[PDB]
Amino acid sequence: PVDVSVSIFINKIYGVNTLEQTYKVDGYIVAQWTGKPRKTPGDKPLIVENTQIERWINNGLWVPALEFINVVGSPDTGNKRLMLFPDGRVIYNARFLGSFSNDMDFRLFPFDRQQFVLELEPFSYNNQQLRFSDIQVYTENIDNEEIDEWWIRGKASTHISDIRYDHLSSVQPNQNEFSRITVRIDAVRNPSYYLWSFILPLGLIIAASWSVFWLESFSERLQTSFTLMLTVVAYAFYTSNILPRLPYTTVIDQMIIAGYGSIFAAILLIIFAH
Amino acid sequence: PVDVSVSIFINKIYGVNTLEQTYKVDGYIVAQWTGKPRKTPGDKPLIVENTQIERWINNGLWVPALEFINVVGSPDTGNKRLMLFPDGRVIYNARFLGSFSNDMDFRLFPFDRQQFVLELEPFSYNNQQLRFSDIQVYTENIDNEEIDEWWIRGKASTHISDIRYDHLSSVQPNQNEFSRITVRIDAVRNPSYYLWSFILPLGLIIAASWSVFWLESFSERLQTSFTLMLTVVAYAFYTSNILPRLPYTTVIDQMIIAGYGSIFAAILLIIFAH
Amino acid sequence: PVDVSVSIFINKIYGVNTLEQTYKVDGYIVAQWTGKPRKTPGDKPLIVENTQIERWINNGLWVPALEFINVVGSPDTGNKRLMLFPDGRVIYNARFLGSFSNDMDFRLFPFDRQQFVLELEPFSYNNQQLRFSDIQVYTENIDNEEIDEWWIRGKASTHISDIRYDHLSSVQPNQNEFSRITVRIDAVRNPSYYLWSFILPLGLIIAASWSVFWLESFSERLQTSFTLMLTVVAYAFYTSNILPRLPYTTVIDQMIIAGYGSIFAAILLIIFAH
Amino acid sequence: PVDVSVSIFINKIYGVNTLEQTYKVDGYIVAQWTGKPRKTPGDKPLIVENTQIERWINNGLWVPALEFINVVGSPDTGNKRLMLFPDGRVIYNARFLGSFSNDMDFRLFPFDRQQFVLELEPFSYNNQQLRFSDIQVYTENIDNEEIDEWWIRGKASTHISDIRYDHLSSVQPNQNEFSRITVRIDAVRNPSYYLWSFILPLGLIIAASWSVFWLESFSERLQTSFTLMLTVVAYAFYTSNILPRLPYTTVIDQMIIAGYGSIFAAILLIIFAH
Amino acid sequence: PVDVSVSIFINKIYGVNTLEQTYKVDGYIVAQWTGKPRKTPGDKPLIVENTQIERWINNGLWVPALEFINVVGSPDTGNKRLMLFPDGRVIYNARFLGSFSNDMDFRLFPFDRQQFVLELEPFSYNNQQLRFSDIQVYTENIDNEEIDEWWIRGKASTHISDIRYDHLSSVQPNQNEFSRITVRIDAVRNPSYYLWSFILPLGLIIAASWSVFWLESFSERLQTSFTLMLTVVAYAFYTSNILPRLPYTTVIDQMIIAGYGSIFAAILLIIFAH
């Protein structure tokens, strides 16, 4: 089994779409392994850039195809480098960009602590043919940065495991477990914008809804309550465009439901009084 | 006729757009068949990855093109593997991602029970040239998962049938029936978000619309009724962006129509009283 | 002139964007012609699938490029088949998907009767080099189906004509007329959704606007009339997102204008009374 | 210098996005020049279609790359034809589709008179190596047509000029001026939809805002004025989605500002009266 | 180390999306270096256009791959020219178009002064193999232009630095520093549209909110205050669609918060008075 040393450098993390539950990671991947010795022209190592790499693969060079498990669509791979050394070591450099997905729960939606997970795996070579030696993840550009509305905390966790694929067991009986690399980056959402845009004005709405019981009337009090109902509907307008359609309720959703319940409680209270 | 054994592994199902009536399925497809024996270098089977596969096809290797019938656009095929064995068996591995479409009725829109259908078929080889032996669908990653707002129930149904194409009968008189694989995954929509976002607040609107007949007046009662009309129009705003434009009416649509009818009934009632 | 028999099979028609005045047609195209006899290996016809077709074109095989005249962008061509027969006949099978455009008038917008037109034409071969023998259009999948909000009525009309190109007359003086195939599918819009979503509620708005003259007041009547004005503006909100920006007025637009005129007529009437 | 005769045929002009200030032009381009005589098989001219053209370029054939200067993104080039004649003349036919951009001022926004400009230029050959002889633009399909909301007036202007590039002066000292073709099509916007959708209802709003001074009250007059303020805000909602963010003000924008000023003038007037 | 002289010509800067914090730069890049002397056919320099360039790279020609560091996605590279001179000098011309990103702070959002940064760097060659001699940036087309809503001030700053990559230190111990070119264009936002669209009408809202204390009542004053609350919510609707979700507050956001605070201050003031 060929031992492959991966070095994932995260250039930037952007495009975090909470509705689609996806994010875009740009960076470079450096895979290194030792193969058969070769006689390159000159004692210096020879560098193969994009396209010229194929001629070498048609000649018979072994280059693994390292795919991303949790990618959405084909990754937008840019330039590729294949640096071949006389001794035998091969260094494969490539720039990747793709949309990655995660579970991404939203129980505490303004105060999310989500993990950006990159899963890397060979497409066709199992651990009896290709083993991952180690990975160092260099998240130096975004180690402590306020990317989008997200705070990156700490370093990036690295993990190497074996994944058994039961769909490949019928075609490959004894050898179907694949070496997988998991790269986890813990991210904390910045809650400031939601704090001054949603929670505080809806709190003012709740206070104004409490303030309707100071009238010595019944009809214009009803019109006031339905004006507040229209205002709460207005606040529920641009609520579903910031978080996905979740079966559970979040803080903004419970505040909207509390506003609806407060208005309807005022309605039933004045109807019971009448 | 070459017998081809397919093994569709569904990695994830996502992007279920109810307006477009489409969904995105990501996964791998494993086609296996036995051909002529060949002398690979070494007794071990030889693995061909993306691109190097073509050289083999130019040499004269028979590799079928398994298309998706119900796909929207070209599928975003990633890496491909062609694992050739000395004996003769050929294993074709490929990763697919495309937008698939189904009939997808919405009679009970918050309580949908839709089927995600994948149809697989050879493009050019009929059942006199290529027959599908069997398919095992491995939906283990999403067997019981809350993907998007959808619940996957049970396993995946497998079916192999023959499809007669009458447009190919004029060019191929006696041999125009094609072997087709249908993969059905039954999905149940999670109704919780709609339950606390649409039905309950519109029920409060209906209760408030009932509550207008407690006024001893005529003009401000009219202004109250038109304020409620504006509120129901506001609720009809973000109604057409969650389900497609259907000839029939659904539960949210009947609740909106009931609100409109209740307000107009109040209008005609107070006009008849005056 | 080579006689080419086309057989267009319409798999589905979807994505009918009335704002862009475009629609998406998916299906297969079967072109058949007789060329020089050839000695294929074996008496059976030889099938060339995607990619391997080019090698044959580099060898010198004559394969026409049948383009779509009214397409928007490049068509998303999937798999291609080239079935070569010993005798000489060549059958060209290809799967096409593209956005097509038509004139698509909207005088009676909820009750549209539009035609989906597919125009097929060789790119480089005129009728002195390539003539279209006949076309049979097999619209069997959508012969009577409720696709989107559209009803497909009857069969598909077929037509073969010669198109003179005056821009090619300066470079080709005597031979610049091209054989063109026009495929027309008559479609009827389903008016039910608009009937229960726009016409009926706006009729209720018109009735409520008539109902303002029952007040014995002047100021709160004015406030009622401007509340109705705000409601009509709300109904004009999600009006321009369902049909394109047309110089003429349609039924929804005339209903909105009638609502505006009714409110302003009420305003001028009460001002004249005062 | 090789004299190249261009013949641009405009099939259609569509997708005029005023916000992006871009438009989509579909059509064919016919470039013709005379080169070295060649012995084609047979006295008839030989036609090279897409792909087979490259083999000829690898053989050493001189085919210029005619780029579009004002294009947005890569043009969506479809089929290409290279018609080679025994004598020597070469005719290059290609179908282009791309997003083009212009200055596109909006001083009189409902009554725009904009020019659709296509700029064509060789990428690498200057006028010491490639000169444009003439261009005839055949805008016969859209000579007098109501495309989108735009009226095409007259024919298309043709112009051939030399463009000096100062960025190529350091690498090419004496020869850096390039022959450029400018194709201008004058377009007039159809003002009918805006006339019955924006100007007339906002005029009714202005009349109703004038009508507030008929009340013998102060509080409900204030509530009426703020209802009209909410209506003008509603009309300012779907105002910024039809024209881009311009430093200057247009007719719809001045009408909105006049409505705001009229309401605030009413407010200050009644406050001064009180 | 090969000295490479770059000449970046900025054709246009457009598509400045403040929400995505990205912008689109179109233009041409001219890289020039001196290599081994060659015997071209004829004393004149030989021009290689797109595609034919590869044959030369397969022959063994050294052409660097100059990537963009801050690009979003793959750049939409169009035509490429490789002009080879007898002496030895090679001129590489290419047209690039891609989405670039910057830090792009928005402390003074209507009065932004942002920098459009283009970072250019070889993908595989370090400064021991490729050194950047100089860069001249020719921003002559947009030197003083009102592109979008942005004013370009002055010329473009040029900078050449060495970037040490610590992720390449494990694979290349002593040689991992790369020559980088930074091109900065200072841009000033045009504040006119925001000045007459947001600040002035919200100032009128603030004045009207001050004007509520002129009523001798309590209930209709409350209804007036909640009508103003609904108007401020309406103004907060189309506020989050022009600037991204920032942790800090900007001028429009502070004006919205001031309106909310003024209305709630009026509410608490009249409640304290009652």
Numbering used by the authors:
A (entry chain E), B (entry chain A), C (entry chain B), D (entry chain C), E (entry chain D): 11 to 284
Task: Give sentences from the paper.
Activation and opening of the channel involves a tilting of the top of M2 away from the pore axis and partial loss of the helix, such that 16′ and 9′ turn away from the pore. In the extracellular domain (ECD), ELIC activation is characterized by a counter-clockwise rotation of the ECD relative to the TMD.
Single particle cryo-EM of ELIC in these nanodiscs in the presence of the agonist, propylamine (50 mM), yielded structures with an overall resolution of 3.71 Å for SMA, 3.28 Å for saposin, 3.12 Å for spMSP1D1, and 3.17 Å for spNW15. Comparison of the agonist-bound structures of ELIC in the different nanodiscs also shows progressive tilting of the top of M2 away from the pore axis in the order: SMAELIC < saposinELIC~MSP1E3D1ELIC~spMSP1D1ELIC < spNW15ELIC. This is evident in the mean distance between M2 Cα atoms and the pore axis, especially residues 249–251. spNW15ELIC also shows a significant tilting of the bottom of M2 towards the pore axis and the adjacent subunit, narrowing the pore at 2′ (Q233) and -2′ (E230). However, in spNW15ELIC and all other agonist-bound WT structures, the position of 9′ is unchanged forming a tight constriction of the ion permeation pathway. There is no density for M4 in spNW15ELIC indicating that this helix is structurally heterogeneous in the spNW15 nanodisc. The pore of spNW15ELIC shows widening at the top and narrowing at the bottom to a greater extent than any other WT agonist-bound structure.
